[PDB]
Amino acid sequence: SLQPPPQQLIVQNKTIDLPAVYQLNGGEEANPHAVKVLKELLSGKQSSKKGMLISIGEKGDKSVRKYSRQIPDHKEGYYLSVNEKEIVLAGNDERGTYYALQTFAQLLKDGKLPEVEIKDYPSVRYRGVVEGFYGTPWSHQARLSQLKFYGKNKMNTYIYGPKDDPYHSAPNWRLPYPDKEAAQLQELVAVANENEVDFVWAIHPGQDIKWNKEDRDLLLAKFEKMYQLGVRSFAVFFDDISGEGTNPQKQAELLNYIDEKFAQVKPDINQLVMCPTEYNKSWSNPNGNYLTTLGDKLNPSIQIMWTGDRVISDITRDGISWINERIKRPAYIWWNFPVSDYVRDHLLLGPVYGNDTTIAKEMSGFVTNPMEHAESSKIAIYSVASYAWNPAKYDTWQTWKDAIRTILPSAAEELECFAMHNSDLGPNGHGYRREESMDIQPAAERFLKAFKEGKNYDKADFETLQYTFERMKESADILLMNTENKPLIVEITPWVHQFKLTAEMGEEVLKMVERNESYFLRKYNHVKALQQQMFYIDQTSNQNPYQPGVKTATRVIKPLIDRTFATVVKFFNQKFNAHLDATTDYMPHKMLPLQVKANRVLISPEIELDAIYPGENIQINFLSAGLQKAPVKFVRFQFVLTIEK
Ligand SMILES: CC(=O)N[C@H]1C(=O)N[C@H](CO)[C@@H](O)[C@@H]1O
């Protein structure tokens, strides 16, 4: 399964051996980045004047003259051919030759090559990743791994703009990077160049920018320092700000100045991009002059970014028409998935879908804003690369499966299992949701409906739930111990622990559904302990300020387990005249369920705590009171008690 799939492909359903002896033509004249890859593939083998011809080069080179008519007339296009007599790897340009090689590397398996002819090129000009989220910026090592991954998947764009990098945003946007970070950035740029990726350095100055000479020059001076580090593409971001920096005439004038005094003055600058203050339809004022001013005043080589109809949204024909009419050029899409910075307790590991696949001509670029979890984001990134290169042939589920097999071949099925039940965002303020657990959703819905009603459930539905919980546990334990991609396992580990507990809880609740009073009570007590363990994980892992903790299988599996538990406990309580607690989340404090978030104890919008704590403050909203470290166990009257914990 070639990813991205080529524009055109003819296969012969024959294979040949990769030539043990070969003659290489054009090795001195072709893209050195491409020749390096070819040479690594042919290692062990060796070149002579005999043996199979392998021709590599760009249109115009001597090596590929014979094929000049077969080379697509598109930027980054290439012609590839393998038959009994020779191998052709011919780009329309240097990047095309490299892309030819990335396809060729995928064809080669166990020293054999299929006989094929490919004519290929991207449907969207700029394809890649914007590291543009809130949260811990990607590590240096993660970024090195990302750049290599993008080369392999024909992504030509990496936009560097982590919101919490102080040299990117306010106020240290004015300051050059310190030496250590500068040497790292310099290495990232070299590695990007090696993998045919435009390293685009973004700046986010709008929150405190002054529309004067001093700040303009400081911005230019910053861009110059980035240029000295090897940066050749640049962006200015005006998103998520308020105040004078939102002025569209001034934004456009600054961007045109950068264009005219910098971009068009250096020998070798590539992309110049801006993200507008009105960057999605809902945050736009259809009766305001912001977008039309940008559209009219911004120089036509400057790109303008867009997230769609909402902050988080998928791209539609009508949605992109709306923006394109105003900005007078094709939007450069900033797709906010799988970014999880507003649902930080979730991993978003499901397929990439929802974007119109017929609108390539309506977009200048398409980049995906990922999770702060770099390796985990490769599922979506791989899929986005496939979509942007060939949207007409974009296959949601096959691409997801291909991504997973590429990222973790040693445990692909296990990672599929984990990812398939870790897809949805849960309720959020952006209203954006994804499907999850859709395979078992009907079996779950029928089981629950029957059970709650006192009608009999289908045995096969019970067994499918059983099968699911079993596979979840196998998948969790195998992933925990996997050493093929350690950085990935480090990222997902807390969710993997939570996912295993979920599956164990499901097994026990199903045993509760099935014997005698004694047995039921053993199962019940086991489930209570597992709820407590899930609490401990939710309280100790991923403790960020915004959405702390660890949620998993939230769409279908957890509600099924919880509702089944509440139901069987009710039945037991009726049958045995008992008063077993049916609550589904463990809560050590007593009172709408209470919630614990960090050192906050809140009522879901008299409380007795499990101990005496020093009080910090109380916040109510139908109000606030400093508690000045006073001992507190009881609070009697949002409704949030903060304690020292
Ligand atoms: C253009 C844009 O999307 N800006 C920000 C934004 O508005 N939302 C996403 C998702 O929270 C942020 O990561 C991103 O930095």
XYZ file of C-alpha atoms and ligand atoms in Angstrom:
660
model
C 0.000 0.000 0.000
C 1.875 3.060 -1.303
C 1.447 6.162 0.852
C 0.673 8.667 -0.356
C -0.846 6.742 -3.281
C 0.574 7.968 -6.623
C -1.529 9.937 -9.113
C -1.062 7.211 -11.685
C 0.141 3.658 -11.338
C 0.394 0.699 -13.711
C 1.478 -2.611 -12.203
C 2.451 -5.805 -14.011
C 1.880 -8.314 -11.183
C 5.434 -9.537 -11.827
C 8.455 -8.948 -9.568
C 12.189 -8.636 -10.222
C 15.189 -8.816 -7.881
C 16.859 -5.576 -6.863
C 19.999 -5.795 -9.078
C 23.045 -7.320 -7.389
C 25.090 -5.613 -10.083
C 23.928 -2.359 -11.601
C 25.061 0.590 -13.651
C 24.174 3.936 -12.139
C 23.581 6.851 -14.469
C 23.223 10.431 -13.220
C 24.538 9.958 -9.669
C 26.736 13.016 -9.975
C 24.085 15.332 -11.476
C 20.960 14.365 -9.461
C 19.620 15.656 -6.132
C 22.270 14.599 -3.641
C 19.509 13.956 -1.067
C 17.922 11.482 -3.500
C 21.255 9.803 -4.478
C 22.078 9.224 -0.798
C 18.838 7.276 -0.300
C 19.397 5.279 -3.463
C 22.897 4.434 -2.353
C 21.681 3.223 1.067
C 19.166 0.929 -0.638
C 21.853 -0.536 -2.907
C 24.275 -1.137 -0.056
C 26.076 -4.444 -0.196
C 25.454 -4.481 -3.911
C 27.963 -2.784 -6.169
C 28.172 -0.679 -9.292
C 29.884 -1.458 -12.599
C 29.487 -0.775 -16.333
C 27.644 -4.130 -16.672
C 24.291 -5.135 -15.119
C 20.893 -3.414 -14.851
C 20.765 0.275 -15.715
C 19.459 2.574 -12.978
C 18.885 6.108 -14.190
C 18.418 8.993 -11.739
C 18.083 12.712 -12.407
C 15.963 15.809 -12.847
C 14.305 16.809 -16.125
C 17.122 18.404 -18.131
C 19.886 16.093 -16.852
C 21.627 13.829 -19.451
C 20.764 10.713 -17.434
C 16.996 11.082 -17.959
C 16.724 12.487 -21.526
C 14.958 9.331 -22.767
C 12.124 9.843 -20.240
C 11.563 13.601 -20.561
C 8.044 13.067 -21.983
C 7.018 10.756 -19.132
C 8.051 13.140 -16.327
C 4.983 14.980 -15.027
C 4.956 18.718 -15.658
C 4.263 19.560 -12.025
C 6.352 20.956 -9.178
C 7.664 17.984 -7.116
C 6.430 15.601 -9.835
C 8.332 12.477 -10.866
C 8.376 9.474 -13.203
C 9.296 6.093 -11.763
C 9.652 2.833 -13.675
C 10.836 -0.669 -12.860
C 10.968 -3.456 -15.412
C 13.197 -6.410 -16.326
C 15.742 -4.198 -18.161
C 16.047 -0.951 -16.155
C 15.006 1.286 -13.236
C 14.033 4.916 -13.763
C 13.873 7.611 -11.054
C 13.308 10.968 -12.747
C 12.001 14.092 -11.064
C 10.520 17.162 -12.686
C 12.728 18.965 -10.137
C 15.162 18.105 -7.328
C 12.349 17.514 -4.832
C 10.563 15.266 -7.324
C 13.681 13.077 -7.608
C 13.759 12.681 -3.832
C 10.033 11.842 -3.804
C 10.647 9.231 -6.511
C 13.091 7.663 -4.096
C 10.636 7.693 -1.194
C 8.192 5.757 -3.366
C 10.948 3.404 -4.554
C 11.926 2.623 -0.940
C 8.317 1.502 -0.329
C 8.328 -0.805 -3.396
C 11.459 -2.618 -2.239
C 10.648 -5.575 0.018
C 12.921 -8.590 0.720
C 15.343 -7.653 -2.077
C 12.531 -7.622 -4.642
C 10.775 -4.932 -6.699
C 7.420 -5.038 -8.455
C 7.330 -4.135 -12.137
C 5.586 -0.785 -12.158
C 5.264 2.555 -13.878
C 4.310 5.608 -11.842
C 3.580 9.169 -12.776
C 3.102 11.145 -9.605
C 2.878 14.664 -8.189
C 1.125 16.355 -5.265
C -2.349 17.915 -5.633
C -1.618 20.494 -2.917
C 1.526 22.634 -3.151
C 2.443 22.911 0.586
C 1.890 19.848 2.843
C 2.981 19.267 6.408
C 2.861 20.151 10.091
C 2.469 23.305 12.124
C 3.899 22.742 15.620
C 1.504 25.443 16.791
C -0.228 24.131 19.953
C -0.296 25.263 23.605
C 1.553 22.969 26.043
C 5.053 21.491 26.321
C 6.821 22.115 22.988
C 8.204 19.015 21.221
C 11.635 17.921 22.434
C 14.676 18.355 20.156
C 14.860 14.600 19.682
C 11.141 14.406 18.785
C 11.597 17.153 16.154
C 14.577 15.341 14.558
C 12.409 12.214 14.288
C 9.480 14.278 12.863
C 11.614 15.781 10.083
C 12.757 12.386 8.854
C 9.160 11.121 8.964
C 7.995 14.079 6.835
C 10.643 13.392 4.151
C 9.418 9.773 3.965
C 5.828 10.876 3.531
C 6.415 13.716 1.054
C 5.533 16.483 3.478
C 7.515 19.558 2.392
C 6.552 21.975 5.224
C 7.310 22.235 8.943
C 6.060 25.416 10.563
C 7.728 26.022 13.897
C 5.432 27.999 16.241
C 4.888 26.488 19.718
C 2.669 28.895 21.647
C 4.661 28.433 24.859
C 8.110 29.022 23.309
C 9.012 32.418 24.799
C 11.268 33.320 21.813
C 8.275 32.710 19.525
C 5.577 34.624 21.425
C 5.317 37.620 23.769
C 7.333 39.184 24.994
C 10.646 37.517 24.157
C 9.812 37.364 20.457
C 12.146 40.381 20.288
C 15.130 38.386 21.668
C 17.440 36.091 19.690
C 17.424 32.459 20.923
C 20.114 31.624 23.495
C 23.152 29.746 22.092
C 21.968 26.271 23.080
C 18.504 26.612 21.493
C 20.047 28.393 18.500
C 22.443 25.479 17.830
C 19.477 23.100 18.121
C 17.452 25.197 15.655
C 20.415 25.256 13.310
C 20.605 21.412 13.388
C 16.829 21.159 12.816
C 17.157 23.349 9.709
C 20.027 21.212 8.332
C 18.012 18.037 8.955
C 14.907 19.624 7.364
C 16.985 20.544 4.280
C 18.298 16.946 4.046
C 14.717 15.634 4.020
C 13.422 18.256 1.525
C 11.353 20.019 4.201
C 10.930 23.779 4.308
C 11.630 24.792 7.903
C 9.236 27.739 8.348
C 10.028 29.817 11.431
C 6.932 31.617 12.793
C 6.742 34.594 15.137
C 3.706 35.520 17.297
C 4.170 39.203 18.209
C 0.634 40.605 17.982
C -0.284 40.627 21.712
C 2.217 43.352 22.663
C 3.469 44.654 19.305
C 3.700 48.421 18.878
C 3.059 49.796 15.400
C 6.340 51.788 15.420
C 9.903 51.669 13.977
C 11.477 50.042 17.049
C 9.271 46.890 17.017
C 9.282 46.589 13.216
C 13.099 46.616 13.239
C 13.243 44.202 16.152
C 11.008 41.838 14.220
C 13.195 42.143 11.138
C 16.299 41.773 13.279
C 14.843 38.566 14.743
C 14.126 37.261 11.220
C 17.718 38.081 10.254
C 19.060 36.094 13.236
C 16.882 33.162 12.145
C 18.252 33.550 8.579
C 21.813 33.300 9.975
C 20.772 29.969 11.531
C 19.781 28.706 8.036
C 16.024 29.498 8.074
C 14.640 30.283 4.594
C 10.859 30.433 5.129
C 9.058 32.710 7.580
C 5.632 33.244 9.118
C 3.902 35.903 11.213
C 1.022 34.710 13.378
C -1.699 37.115 14.643
C -4.042 34.483 16.162
C -5.533 34.401 19.691
C -4.741 38.041 20.479
C -6.528 41.251 21.449
C -5.678 44.940 21.149
C -3.864 47.102 18.591
C -2.069 44.091 17.070
C -5.396 43.002 15.514
C -5.311 46.019 13.105
C -5.568 44.568 9.509
C -4.081 47.545 7.597
C -1.032 47.511 9.898
C -0.660 43.711 9.730
C -0.751 43.861 5.924
C 1.752 46.779 5.866
C 4.151 44.901 8.161
C 3.874 41.714 6.035
C 4.392 43.677 2.815
C 7.421 45.385 4.335
C 8.892 41.997 5.355
C 8.110 40.795 1.817
C 9.648 43.825 0.096
C 12.616 44.492 2.389
C 13.504 40.877 3.321
C 11.793 38.077 1.399
C 12.340 39.634 -2.036
C 15.830 40.936 -1.112
C 17.563 37.742 0.112
C 18.946 35.410 -2.534
C 16.983 32.351 -1.445
C 13.845 32.880 0.637
C 10.946 30.482 -0.003
C 7.615 30.692 1.889
C 6.164 33.771 3.540
C 2.980 33.025 5.497
C 0.644 34.793 7.863
C -2.090 33.528 10.197
C -4.851 36.164 10.509
C -6.608 37.345 13.687
C -9.846 36.250 12.005
C -8.695 32.730 11.219
C -11.986 30.870 11.078
C -15.544 31.832 10.029
C -16.985 31.899 13.552
C -14.203 34.247 14.730
C -14.671 36.428 11.664
C -16.935 39.468 11.389
C -18.790 39.131 8.079
C -19.752 42.845 8.391
C -16.260 43.966 9.378
C -13.470 44.954 7.041
C -10.747 42.675 8.454
C -10.590 39.855 5.920
C -11.326 42.000 2.853
C -8.595 44.456 3.878
C -6.074 41.591 4.192
C -7.282 40.182 0.874
C -6.893 43.504 -0.960
C -3.732 44.853 0.707
C -1.536 41.750 1.293
C 1.013 41.145 -1.476
C -0.136 38.272 -3.641
C 2.797 35.952 -2.884
C 1.964 36.017 0.834
C -0.009 32.994 2.168
C -3.008 33.409 4.476
C -3.932 30.657 6.927
C -7.402 29.398 7.829
C -8.752 26.776 10.291
C -12.198 26.437 8.636
C -15.726 27.362 9.809
C -14.720 27.108 13.464
C -11.571 27.035 15.642
C -11.729 23.238 15.286
C -13.353 22.158 12.037
C -13.060 20.052 8.931
C -12.674 21.774 5.530
C -15.680 21.952 3.175
C -16.119 23.320 -0.381
C -18.587 25.979 0.827
C -16.354 26.888 3.811
C -13.248 27.415 1.716
C -15.178 29.322 -1.007
C -16.326 31.720 1.723
C -12.764 32.536 2.842
C -11.189 32.505 -0.653
C -13.667 35.102 -1.949
C -12.539 37.523 0.775
C -8.769 36.947 0.856
C -8.569 36.821 -2.999
C -6.264 33.725 -3.043
C -6.528 30.043 -2.087
C -6.407 29.585 1.708
C -3.433 27.791 3.307
C -5.225 25.402 5.654
C -4.242 25.100 9.340
C -6.170 21.986 10.382
C -6.657 21.729 14.127
C -6.401 17.947 14.511
C -5.058 16.057 16.203
C -4.120 18.942 18.532
C -5.381 18.075 22.004
C -4.363 21.169 23.979
C -7.972 21.863 25.008
C -8.753 18.181 25.846
C -5.367 17.342 27.385
C -6.662 14.319 29.307
C -7.443 12.575 25.940
C -5.228 11.041 23.248
C -6.628 11.449 19.693
C -5.352 8.432 17.820
C -8.189 7.818 15.337
C -8.362 8.215 11.533
C -8.112 11.495 9.694
C -11.490 12.156 7.962
C -14.090 14.890 7.318
C -12.185 17.090 4.874
C -13.557 17.466 1.360
C -11.434 15.386 -1.023
C -12.330 17.335 -4.251
C -11.054 20.793 -3.223
C -7.275 20.561 -3.861
C -7.403 23.543 -6.273
C -9.035 25.729 -3.627
C -6.082 25.451 -1.226
C -2.476 26.691 -1.318
C -1.425 24.467 1.551
C -2.656 22.080 4.213
C -0.915 21.568 7.523
C -1.936 19.678 10.659
C -1.578 21.086 14.178
C -0.733 17.986 16.247
C -0.703 16.880 19.898
C 2.098 17.818 22.271
C 2.613 14.016 22.032
C 4.930 13.933 18.981
C 5.177 10.182 18.207
C 1.455 9.608 18.911
C 0.632 12.369 16.374
C 2.369 10.404 13.577
C -0.827 8.423 12.964
C -2.663 11.620 11.943
C 0.413 13.221 10.311
C 1.021 10.209 8.037
C -2.676 10.350 7.116
C -2.630 14.072 6.437
C 0.451 13.612 4.225
C -1.491 11.000 2.222
C -4.587 13.196 2.006
C -2.793 16.360 0.889
C -0.649 14.614 -1.707
C -3.553 12.669 -3.285
C -6.896 13.764 -1.901
C -8.867 12.129 -4.778
C -7.603 8.701 -3.738
C -7.701 9.409 0.008
C -8.807 6.304 1.987
C -9.477 7.105 5.636
C -9.276 3.616 7.212
C -6.566 2.051 5.005
C -4.289 5.053 5.652
C -4.868 4.827 9.441
C -3.917 1.106 9.329
C -0.871 1.848 7.128
C 0.233 4.616 9.504
C 0.024 2.296 12.514
C 1.873 -0.558 10.782
C 4.584 1.895 9.718
C 5.016 3.405 13.174
C 4.959 0.156 15.185
C 5.352 -2.878 12.896
C 6.229 -5.120 15.861
C 2.839 -4.551 17.490
C 0.554 -3.096 14.870
C -2.614 -4.948 15.874
C -2.191 -3.987 19.514
C -1.695 -0.335 18.629
C -4.794 -0.469 16.373
C -6.744 -1.852 19.344
C -5.508 0.943 21.615
C -6.002 3.721 18.979
C -9.484 2.577 17.946
C -10.774 3.188 21.524
C -8.848 6.416 21.989
C -10.310 8.638 19.203
C -12.933 10.951 20.690
C -12.336 14.236 22.460
C -15.243 14.003 24.895
C -17.450 17.084 25.442
C -15.562 20.358 24.902
C -16.116 24.081 24.354
C -15.242 23.770 20.627
C -18.052 21.268 19.968
C -15.693 18.975 18.031
C -16.056 15.223 18.352
C -14.753 12.094 16.630
C -16.155 8.550 16.296
C -14.730 5.844 18.571
C -15.305 2.160 19.225
C -17.764 2.065 16.271
C -17.159 -1.647 15.700
C -18.800 -2.631 18.995
C -21.117 0.341 19.403
C -24.229 -1.500 18.199
C -23.517 -4.590 20.319
C -23.019 -2.254 23.270
C -26.211 -0.290 22.577
C -28.350 -3.430 22.290
C -26.891 -5.071 25.374
C -27.497 -2.025 27.511
C -31.022 -1.376 26.216
C -32.082 -4.968 26.857
C -30.436 -5.164 30.258
C -31.941 -1.954 31.609
C -35.418 -3.063 30.468
C -35.405 -6.589 31.921
C -35.462 -8.104 28.422
C -32.833 -10.752 27.608
C -29.652 -9.676 25.838
C -28.124 -11.591 22.911
C -25.365 -13.906 24.066
C -23.218 -12.902 21.078
C -23.277 -9.260 22.251
C -22.105 -10.364 25.720
C -19.301 -12.408 24.094
C -18.220 -9.488 21.852
C -17.836 -7.290 24.947
C -15.885 -10.126 26.585
C -13.710 -10.496 23.479
C -13.084 -6.722 23.439
C -11.993 -6.530 27.083
C -9.652 -9.485 26.585
C -7.988 -7.938 23.524
C -7.624 -4.564 25.324
C -5.593 -6.245 28.124
C -3.325 -8.110 25.688
C -2.811 -4.874 23.747
C -2.081 -2.818 26.883
C 0.513 -5.273 28.329
C 2.300 -5.751 24.986
C 2.459 -1.990 24.244
C 3.768 -1.267 27.772
C 6.707 -3.563 27.128
C 7.407 -2.567 23.524
C 10.954 -1.332 22.863
C 10.782 -0.701 19.079
C 9.510 2.869 19.579
C 10.304 3.809 23.187
C 9.408 7.503 22.852
C 5.920 6.505 21.680
C 5.475 4.131 24.623
C 6.622 6.815 27.090
C 3.985 9.200 25.630
C 1.024 6.812 25.871
C 1.947 4.821 28.997
C -0.453 6.502 31.453
C -3.354 6.044 29.025
C -2.256 2.423 28.464
C -2.431 1.775 32.259
C -5.916 3.385 32.373
C -7.024 1.385 29.280
C -5.971 -1.898 30.964
C -7.917 -1.018 34.121
C -10.934 -0.190 31.941
C -10.818 -3.642 30.352
C -10.413 -5.384 33.765
C -13.353 -3.407 35.134
C -15.403 -4.458 32.089
C -14.547 -8.132 32.674
C -15.618 -7.898 36.334
C -18.863 -6.038 35.586
C -19.723 -8.795 33.070
C -19.086 -11.390 35.783
C -21.525 -9.405 37.940
C -24.116 -9.704 35.164
C -23.678 -13.477 35.029
C -23.904 -16.944 39.951
C -24.540 -16.350 43.650
C -24.643 -13.597 46.274
C -21.141 -14.314 47.537
C -19.621 -14.260 44.083
C -21.410 -11.073 43.125
C -20.032 -9.332 46.207
C -16.472 -10.407 45.418
C -16.915 -8.977 41.897
C -18.476 -5.804 43.246
C -15.630 -5.216 45.686
C -13.094 -5.879 42.907
C -14.809 -3.280 40.693
C -14.759 -0.703 43.518
C -10.973 -1.277 43.859
C -10.497 -0.853 40.097
C -12.494 2.437 40.195
C -10.148 3.589 42.934
C -7.093 2.640 40.884
C -8.454 4.536 37.883
C -8.853 7.558 40.219
C -5.243 7.302 41.363
C -4.056 7.332 37.782
C -6.328 10.272 36.942
C -4.830 12.133 39.932
C -1.137 11.331 39.545
C -0.479 11.286 35.784
C -0.587 14.162 33.292
C -1.307 16.733 35.970
C -1.499 19.846 33.734
C -3.287 23.094 34.750
C -6.081 22.751 32.214
C -7.487 19.213 31.804
C -5.429 17.090 34.231
C -5.507 13.324 34.274
C -6.096 10.413 31.985
C -9.277 9.442 30.170
C -9.648 6.514 27.796
C -12.344 4.597 25.860
C -14.735 7.394 26.841
C -17.249 7.347 24.000
C -18.667 3.841 24.138
C -16.758 1.485 26.406
C -16.615 3.373 29.729
C -20.287 4.498 29.622
C -21.288 0.900 28.847
C -19.265 -0.421 31.815
C -20.531 2.259 34.190
C -24.205 1.990 33.194
C -24.104 -1.800 33.351
C -22.528 -1.567 36.796
C -25.181 0.887 38.070
C -27.941 -1.376 36.710
C -26.752 -4.724 38.145
C -26.159 -3.120 41.541
C -29.725 -1.783 41.479
C -30.977 -5.294 40.643
C -28.927 -6.840 43.484
C -30.197 -4.195 45.896
C -33.798 -5.089 44.942
C -33.261 -8.850 45.024
C -31.375 -8.993 48.335
C -32.906 -5.915 49.994
C -29.418 -4.343 50.046
C -27.937 -0.830 49.872
C -24.787 -1.277 47.797
C -23.342 1.994 46.468
C -23.922 2.174 42.686
C -21.644 5.194 41.992
C -19.241 4.642 39.103
C -16.339 7.036 39.713
C -14.380 6.783 42.929
C -14.544 9.921 45.036
C -12.729 10.000 48.418
C -14.562 13.181 49.517
C -18.290 13.262 50.339
C -21.165 15.633 49.667
C -24.197 16.098 41.323
C -20.894 14.237 41.753
C -17.870 15.909 43.367
C -14.730 16.185 41.239
C -11.068 16.420 42.137
C -8.832 18.462 39.902
C -5.328 19.025 41.214
C -5.726 20.763 44.567
C -9.304 21.737 43.759
C -12.392 19.989 45.069
C -15.505 20.953 43.135
C -19.163 20.111 42.609
C -20.051 19.280 39.024
C -21.630 22.556 37.745
C -22.220 20.275 52.580
C -18.861 18.786 51.535
C -16.835 16.554 53.863
C -13.193 15.981 52.885
C -11.366 12.707 53.660
C -9.058 14.641 56.025
C -8.252 18.069 57.492
C -6.429 20.210 54.911
C -5.221 23.789 54.915
C -7.766 25.824 52.995
C -6.637 28.098 50.196
C -9.812 29.615 48.833
C -13.450 29.052 47.848
C -14.929 30.173 44.551
C -18.633 30.171 43.874
C -20.672 31.432 40.956
C -24.454 31.439 40.719
C -17.894 35.040 44.633
C -14.555 34.298 46.331
C -13.023 34.032 49.814
C -9.375 33.562 50.830
C -9.155 30.926 53.547
C -5.641 31.955 54.684
C -4.352 28.411 55.314
C -7.110 27.667 57.885
C -7.692 23.959 58.682
C -10.725 22.635 56.782
C -12.578 19.315 56.544
C -16.191 20.531 56.154
C -17.538 23.227 53.812
C -21.207 24.190 54.130
C -23.291 26.661 52.152
C -19.192 26.830 40.058
C -18.500 25.698 43.608
C -14.780 25.058 44.059
C -12.751 24.602 47.237
C -8.997 24.979 46.775
C -6.767 23.334 49.410
C -3.031 22.888 50.030
C -2.393 19.383 48.697
C -4.723 29.316 14.448
C -5.001 28.542 15.702
O -5.641 27.504 15.647
N -4.505 29.066 16.891
C -4.723 28.293 18.147
C -6.186 27.967 18.366
O -7.012 28.869 18.254
N -6.668 26.722 18.694
C -5.726 25.582 18.583
C -6.376 24.418 19.324
O -6.540 24.859 20.692
C -4.403 26.045 19.186
O -3.495 24.951 19.343
C -3.812 27.073 18.214
O -2.551 27.582 18.680
